[model samples]
Each structure stands twice: as C-alpha cells, then as structure tokens.
Target chain A: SVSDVPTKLEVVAATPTSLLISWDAPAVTVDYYVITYGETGGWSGYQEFEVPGSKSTATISGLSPGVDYTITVYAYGYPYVKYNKSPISINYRT
Target chain B: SLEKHSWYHGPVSRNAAEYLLSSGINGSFLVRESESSPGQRSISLRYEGRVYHYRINTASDGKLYVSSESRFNTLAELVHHHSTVADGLITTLHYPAPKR
Candidate 1:
C-alpha cells in the first residue's frame, strides 16, 4: 500500500529572482525527489536527487527577473512503495 | 556675440544700398567718415543678409572691408548684435569726418 499526498511542501526565500523550498519527507523513502521546472513554453528539464528522511530544505537559483516558473515536486519510492508529486506553483521575480 | 559678425569697408551709395538690399541685405550705417588718405573717402555699413552675417571693417585710408563669421538663426536675430558693432563702425567710418 502507498500514500499519494505530500507530507508538507513550502516555498521560501522568494527573492526578486530565485526561490528556495523545504518539504517534509515520507518515511523510509528510498527514491529521489524529482524536481522539474520550466518557463513560458513548457518544461525542459528535471533536477532529480535523493533526500534522506531527515533532510527538509532545497534551494533553486539562477532565475530570470520578472519571469513565471512552474515548479513540480515529486516524491519517489522504489519497488513496492508509492510516489507523490506536488501541483505546480506559480512564482515570479520580486 | 562675435560669433557670426564680420566687418567691411568699401564705397557705398544709394545704388550700392539698393544692390545690397537686393541680395537680402539692408544698409545700416555705422559711420560716414573721411578717408585717412588725403583724397580718398570710405563708408561702411553693417549688413545682414538672409542667411549670412558681416562685420564692418574699415582701413584708416577710407577703404571698406566686409567679412562673415557664422550663421544666426535669422537675420533679425543677427542684426540684434549690430548695436555694439555700430560703435566700432561709427568710429571707423567717421575717422575722416571733420570733428565738430
């Protein structure tokens, strides 16, 4: 069995340009957090990596001024475990 | 200012006045003085043309010379500078004139 909902997700350091975020992790998770973002037209790439059960913060940088970024967070678990992806959040240059 | 102004000294008559005006210039006398030389005579006028400027130059020998420097926005504007210029021309033109 698996739960599909993210435990917690929040965006921080919403500066004039970049964005920082922190999210709660699911227990005993062995899969990576697949972080994907893109501007105007569509998604171009995903930044993926594994986060330990205890880690809670991540920072995304080098964003354009006055731009719209679509960020999606996905929690993954290997084998029989389930995964969760957060809905895209809208952020812009401050 | 001295910018577009020049001086000239030469023979001037009603005919010359008419000719100068025909070329878009008007005769405004600075002075009518006797020639420095015993018999020669000279006259000078501050002339402003439609698009040019002149400063009056007169030699002591009653010779007249005119030269242009630069362009003013309008002849009227350039003529405005002639008042001070009149002082010099008057003295030069009247140089040979009998002093009262």
Candidate 2:
C-alpha cells in the first residue's frame, strides 16, 4: 500500500475566479488526484474535483472574487490507498 | 515607574522593509510621527485579492503590538506569515519548470 502522499503541492492565482493548481507526483502508482478547495477561515464547506493520474496540473474555476481559499490535493493510488499533499492557500481577486 | 514593559523601540529598517516589498508581492509602508513615541509605521499589501494593513503600536506595558488583519508580536513573525504564502506560490508556480 502506498503510505506517502504527493509533496510540494502548489497553487497560483490565475484570475479572480480561477486558480492553477499543481503538485509533484509521488513514487507510487497513482490512478487519479482529488482536489479539495473552499473559502478559508471556515470548515465544513469545500468542493472536490478530480484529475486523471496522468496529469499533475489542473485549473479550478468559479471561485468567488476577493476571497481567500484553501486548497489541498490528494493522490489516489493502486490497490487501496489515498494520500494528500499539504494545503496551499491564496487570496484571489480580479 | 518609567518602565512597565519591554521595549523594542524603533522602526523596521529601510532594508528590511524593502526586502519584503521586493519579495514578488506588491506592498507599501508608511511612517507616522508621534511626539511621545520612537516611531510609528504601517504596512499595506495585496496578496491574491485580500488587502492587509499592518500597524505598529507600543503597548502600555511598552511591548510592541504588530497589528494587521491580525496581531503579531514581532516583525519576524509578521514577515514569516507572508513568507509562507509567498514561498507557497513561488514553489507551486515555478519548479517542475517547463521541459527543455
């Protein structure tokens, strides 16, 4: 079972409502990635998006302008193990 | 008594301020004058979309109170907070650089 997650997950503010997220793929065999993002300073509210295992970058859209969002990326790997990278957060505005 | 609390009475150095402003984040600092105080200053910056304004104050106990959208006791602490965000963006935006 894969016990470690991707490292160095990063984010860039592309636009007021969009973010470019990327991470380094771990050594394990990954099948996909799960991205979780939402407004910061609050919990219990986040949206999850998926990326194919072959890709390490993604663009997320429809975010509120002028809001601080926290994002985390997870690697779903072979057999039965899911791992998460560190949370990357940024304030976004047009 | 003339002394009630610890004092770090001075403005953030010009070099230190400039170093922070040049760290790929847009920000500015202003000096406020006080007849009874050593120096007064405030820093303003926009990261992502959020605006942060940090003001320097000397407490009754004579300790420095660094207040922005939040409060920090030292300049290092304040800069450290932004440094984390700056580093995060840099690490994410760059690296894994485009393949030659």
Candidate 3:
C-alpha cells in the first residue's frame, strides 16, 4: 500500500554550494528514500542520492550559488509501491 | 589567505609548478598565482602522466568557482569542497604538494 509518505520534506542551504535535505520519517514502514535534485531550467537532468530509512536526513554538495533547485523524495521498499503519478517536490534556492 | 599556505607559490611558472608536483601521487595539488595566464590564480594537480591545471575564476556575483559547476567563498573553501569529490575536475584533490 502507498500509505506511508516521507511527510514534510524540507531543505535548507548549508552553504551556497550545499544543502541539508530532510524529512519526517514514515511512522509505518520504509526501506529507504530516493532523493533527486538539480538546477532549474537547465533541463540537464537531476543527480540522485539515496538515504537509508534509518536516517532522516542527507546533505548534497557541489551546487552553484544563487540558483533555484527542485528536489524530489520518495520512500521505497522491496515491493512496488508508487506514491503517486508525481513524486514529492521541494522548490528552493541557495 | 592564499599566500599564507606553503603550497601556494605566488608567481611560479607552469613548468616549475609541474616540476614541483611531478613525483607526487595522483591527486597531489598546489595553488599557484599562474604562469601564462599572467595574473589569475590556478590549482595545479597531478593524476597520471598528465598534470592538470584548474583556474580560480572570480565571478560577477562575488563568488569563486573552478568552472560553471559550484561556487565557493575562498580558495581554502574551494579546496575543502573538492577534497571529497572531483565534481568537475579530472580527479579529486588528495595530498597537498607538501603539508607544510
């Protein structure tokens, strides 16, 4: 069931070139979280980072300063469980 | 701050910079005031037969970056930022030309 969502996904810039991405853990169950982010309007495709379900946060580095970014996060496990047609997204700037 | 470090050679030639890092292991690096470019600073690195050179470009936005990828506040910040990953470089910076 697609019941558990990584609710309240949030991101804060640690530096102009880095971000601290985090979310509230799923109370029910989860194996891991998949995070993808990149600059806006670049259409260059996003870079992916995986965080173990045990950890609620991860940091991404090497980003350009003063740029807008879109970050997506989804919980995943063994069986196929899709959150929705579109994943959770956080719109932010560094 | 750039001149304070021993690895930072104020006005060394390209040939001399390579000569200094020649025998170092892959990813050894030093900061130089640069040779041919005339004034801007550059980072010299060795990763093979090749000695890679990356320049520090100061942007209009008042930030420093190796290329278009990421920006840093200073040269020390840039080196620390790239220590863990290559990002845009051919190799990640590991050892200093010499710690001193």
Candidate 4:
C-alpha cells in the first residue's frame, strides 16, 4: 500500500470568513482529499471540504475572525490502509 | 463488475452525476466512482430540485461509510442501509439513477 500524505500543504487567509488552501497529493492514488480545520485551541466544531485530487486547490469560507485555526489534509480512497492516518496539518488565521 | 451496475457510473464527473440525476425526484440517488479520488466513490442525490454529493469514506479496516455513526463492509451494504435510513445523507436512497 502506497502511503505518503499530501505535501506542499499551504493555507492563505482571504476575507474574515474565508481561507484558500492548496497542496500536492501523495504518490499513492486517492479518490480525493479532505481538508478539515477548526479553531486552534478551542477545538470547536471543525469544517470539512472535499477536493478533487486533480485540482489540489479549494477555498474554505464561513470562518470567523479572531480565531487561529488548524488545518489538515488527508487522502481518501477505498481499501487503502495507510493514507488516512497519515494526514499532514498546519495552522492559519482568517 | 461494479461499474456495470446501473447505479454505478464509473469515473464520472461531478457535473455528469448532476446531469444524470437532474430530472430525478427527491431521494433519487446514484453512486459514481470518484474521478479525483482514484479508488473511492461518492453518492449524488437530488433533493429540492438541487443535487447533493456525499463521499463514501473507507475506514481503516475496509468498512465504508457516509456517516461515521454507521459503517458498512461493502458498498452494497451501505446502499441498503441508506435505502432504509438516511443515517447521514440528506434523505434515504429511494430512487436509483435511471440508466440506458
């Protein structure tokens, strides 16, 4: 099973309620990538975005200001065992 | 083959799934092999004149699920469960997407 999580992960702030993210997918093929984020320390309800692997880019909106957030990316597919647990994460603010 | 199933649209685009189900009524659903996610599938269902897509996730042990609360060992099992209970989807999988 191929398993190296998404790489080149980056997140940029947009409007107070939005953040744009981009990343390079792993060598193992996946159906898509899931982007999830929540308040950095509060551990509040996080947001999730399903992005096509081909694009490697998406915009996350409806975030509130004044709260630093933690973002992570993971590859998902079927019958694959090593990708999900190996997601990479980062911190950002909007 | 999984792709041969009427409801299984292999490697179809999101827009294509939408187009295929546009005329379908509420709870009409179809499963598509995700093009972007090479080894996964997603369900596209129409409700309230719009379509909603939900990805079927594979757990560490190979079980598939749309909602973590309930998972299945196979796609067919997932479909059957969702057919009776939304579990996590907007609505139950009532109608299968029409095929040629």
Candidate 5:
C-alpha cells in the first residue's frame, strides 16, 4: 500500500529529431513501472513498457508519425491493489 | 595510468616561448639553442572546413614524431561524425634534415 500526495513524475529530454522520456517512482516501495503508449488517430491496445529496477529514464525509438503522443506512467506496488489509477502522466513529442 | 602527451604548440606561439615557459605551461620543453641544434615540435589544426598549419621543434629521444588529430568542442555531439580514416600520424627523424 504505497500512496503519497502525488506518487509519480515525468520528464522529457529534447533533441533536434528525437525525444527521451523518464519518470520517478513513488517514495514508497513499488514492484514495477508501467508505461502505456500508442499514437494519435489510432486506438490500438496500449503496449506495456517496463523498467527492471528503480531507473528513471527510457527512450522510445522509431517514432516519426507527426503526431504528439499522450503518455502515462503508473507504479504497481505490493499488497496488490488489483486495479487503480496511476499517479503520473504527461504529453510529449517524438 | 600515464596521461596523454599534449604538446600545445599551436595554442601557444613561438614568439611567446620564453614568457610561456617561465609561466610553467610548458616546463618540460627546452628553448631552441641554435639553428644547427634547434629543439622544438610542430602541430596543425583543422576545423570547420579550414586548415591551419604551425611549426615548432624540440629535442626528444634522438627522433621526431609527428601526429595530427581533429578535435571538436563537444564529445557527445561529435560521436555521430566519427570515421575510421581520420587519425594521427607518426614519423621518424633524419639527423641531416633533407630538403622537402
């Protein structure tokens, strides 16, 4: 049971042609970090992206479709709250 | 670990040799004594589609070694432009100094 006022944070690294993303875990312990990503003008089932440890950065590649992506990050912690809202979200370009 | 040898002749000019040596930027180097027994080294810099050549000489190990390398202001940004052909050169010295 890990609950803080705001549990997650997101950041972006900008380049001329690419963008890098990262997030922070809640202060309390967590099992994994989940990232769901898709594209604009589409409704494909969101892909599951995970980081092994408490790392704070991930790079998304092959993304030049000319549309901004809406992204969300959530921490799934122990004591197993089966379905719950993620603590952080952001919108960035690729 | 042994630090790389960086003889900065281009960064410093020959006219200011005495002042620079006194200031300790180049302490290991000895001043050129005579034309017959000159001691110095030379280096060149290529940047932004321009070529710059400079010359100096020093007494070292009874031989002369010359090398040229291209450098940039940012290491991370230059990683994409690396090529196998761009490298340094080393040569042996001839005591009598032949005509070019």
Candidate 6:
C-alpha cells in the first residue's frame, strides 16, 4: 500500500554539483530505496538509482551547479510489489 | 523521563523556537490540529521544506522531543543537525570556548 513511503526526505548542498540526501524508513520492511531527480522548475529529464535497503542516506552527484533540483524518494517493499513515494518534492540548490 | 538544559551560549533567556528563527533557519512554528485525536494540538515547525512536528507534552515537562521525523531532543540540536548535516547552510555550531 502507500504506507511504504519513506519520510523526512532531507537534502543539503555538498559541493558545486552534489547534494547529501537522507530519509527515515517506514514501519514496514523495505527491499530498497529509489531516488529520482530532475530540473527543479522544469520537466525535461531525470536521473534515478536504487540503493540497498540497509542504508538510509545517499550522496547525489553529477548535478548542475547553481541550479535547483527536485528530488524524490521512494520505498519499495519485498519483490517490489508495492511502493510509496515521498509526497513532497524536495527542492534544493546545488 | 524529562531532562532540562540551558542553551549554553548567547541569550539563555530566549525561547528555543525564537532563537532558531533568529539564527537564520528558514522556517516557522505553529499549532497543528490533530484530526485523529480531535482536540489534540501539536507544535510543528516547517524547516527546509519539511514539516517537523514536536510533542507539546514533552515541552511542558521542560523537555523537548522533536517528533519522530528527525528524533531530535532539543530545538538547538535540531537546528544544528539541519544546518550542518542537512542543509550545509551553516558550517559549524559556533559554540563558545567553554564548550569548545
């Protein structure tokens, strides 16, 4: 169901083109975490990746400097059957 | 258990919430009505685009429990956490020599 969504999605400016992101796991068991991001105010394209369930934090790099980016976090249950994406569009400057 | 402590730095008399605002945190504090609990009201702060709800019961006991979102124990701790680890807007906590 939608209960698998990770909460407390946080972002911090790391470098000229990188950001440190973190979140808290939900009440259910998570198989993995999927992170997605795109241009902050535009809808052109996006980049995404999956991190193992054992970890709760990630450092997203290769972003455009000085540009705002929209990042989202999702929690996928076992076998990736049901997934929950964070409700907020975490926006941050790089 | 409720634990009480002082700011350890400038303006020990200032309210924890107000001190955070004066320190450049981009956020606000307000009371949120609980739909499930009906008459219950929760103290919350919107910081860095996320709403961090805190427990009023703990604060009334002279302790601060900054909700389950970040699980911070005090407003100073929460501010320091975001500024240093989450936002990077602040480089350091800037504690005085006594604590440093």
Whose DockQ is greatest here? 2
Candidate 3 residue-wise lDDT at A19: 82
TM-score of every candidate relative to the true structure = 0.34, 0.38, 0.47, 0.50, 0.36, 0.40
Q: For model 4, what is the C-alpha lDDT against the true structure?
A: 0.67
Candidate 3 lDDT over B1-100, as tens digits, reads 4555534567776677776554344565777885556668888887764689988889898788886688988777777677666889888765455321
Chain B TM-score list for all models: 0.24, 0.33, 0.85, 0.91, 0.21, 0.30
List model 2 lDDT by residue over A18-86, tens digit each: 778777765757787766566653343556667898998899888878777666555532211011111
Compose the digit string of candidate 6's lDDT tens values, residues B1-100: 1111111223222233333322122232333335556434444343443335444344544553433334456554554453244332212221111100
lDDT for residue A68 in candidate 3, whole number 0-100: 88
lDDT of 6 at B76: 48
- Find the 10 residues in a row with the least total lDDT in model 5 chain B: B91-100
Model 1 chain B: weakest 10-residue lDDT segment is B91-100
lDDT of 5 by residue, B2-96 (tens): 01112222233444443222211101122122333334333332232222333432224332222224444422112112212223422111010
Residue B11 C-alpha lDDT in model 2:
45
Total residue pair clashes for candidate 4? 6
> Between 2 and 6, whose DockQ is larger?
2
Query: Chain A TM-scores, all candidates?
Result: 0.60, 0.70, 0.79, 0.73, 0.63, 0.75
Cα lDDT for residue A11, candidate 6 = 76
Compute the interface RMSD for each candidate structure. Answer: 44.9, 18.7, 21.6, 15.0, 31.2, 18.2
lDDT of each: 0.37, 0.43, 0.65, 0.67, 0.35, 0.45
Kindly report the docking quality category of candidate 3.
incorrect
**TM-score, model 1, chain B versus true chain B:** 0.24
lDDT of 3 by residue, A1-94 (tens): 1122454777744788888887887667788876767765435545666788898888988888898877766554322111111235566788
Q: Which runs in model 5 stand beyond 4 Å of their true positions?
A: A1-8, A78-87, B1-100
Q: C-alpha displacement of B54 in model 5, angstroms?
A: 81
